Design a protein around this ligand. Structure first.
Ligand SMILES: *[C@@H]1O[C@H](CO)[C@@H](O[C@@H]2O[C@H](CO)[C@@H](O)[C@H](O)[C@H]2NC(C)=O)[C@H](O)[C@H]1NC(C)=O
Lengths: 42, 64
């Protein structure tokens, strides 16, 4: 569970939710509201 | 916090720019006669530092 994925030579560690939907998700997960990191099942 | 480094009759001049994750600094220093506005004339600033830091700068502020 430690290994995860979300300009040139940018890096960004910000924890803010993906607002994938029209909803202003405001820190709450649900349909089209998701935490920005997903884990590789190694 | 993943990067760290250590190293009115005067005018100090500087240039700051950020490009492809590198942050670049140039400067020049001189005595001056008139202190309220920039002295009308020419001299060129020369490099100081070039930092590999990768940050997304949009704002800045001075420290007194
Ligand atoms: C600065 O922030 C912007 C978002 O405000 C970042 O934009 C993303 O950049 C990647 C580059 O491959 C794109 O694929 C994404 O689509 C961009 N996101 C959006 C929402 O447009 C940018 O990467 C950041 N730059 C640095 C140097 O960190």
């Amino acid at each position: 569970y430690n290994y995860r994925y979300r300009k040139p030579f940018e890096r960004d560690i910000s924890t803010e939710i993906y607002q994938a939907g029209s909803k202003p998700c405001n820190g709450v997960e649900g349909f089209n509201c998701y935490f920005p990191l997903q884990s590789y099942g190694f | 916090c993943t990067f760290e480094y250590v190293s009115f009759k005067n005018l100090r001049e500087f240039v700051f720019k950020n490009i492809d994750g590198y942050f670049k600094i140039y400067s020049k220093h001189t005595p001056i006669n008139l202190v309220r506005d920039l002295p009308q004339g020419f001299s060129a600033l020369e490099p100081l530092v070039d930092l590999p830091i990768g940050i997304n700068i949009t704002r800045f502020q001075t420290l007194l």
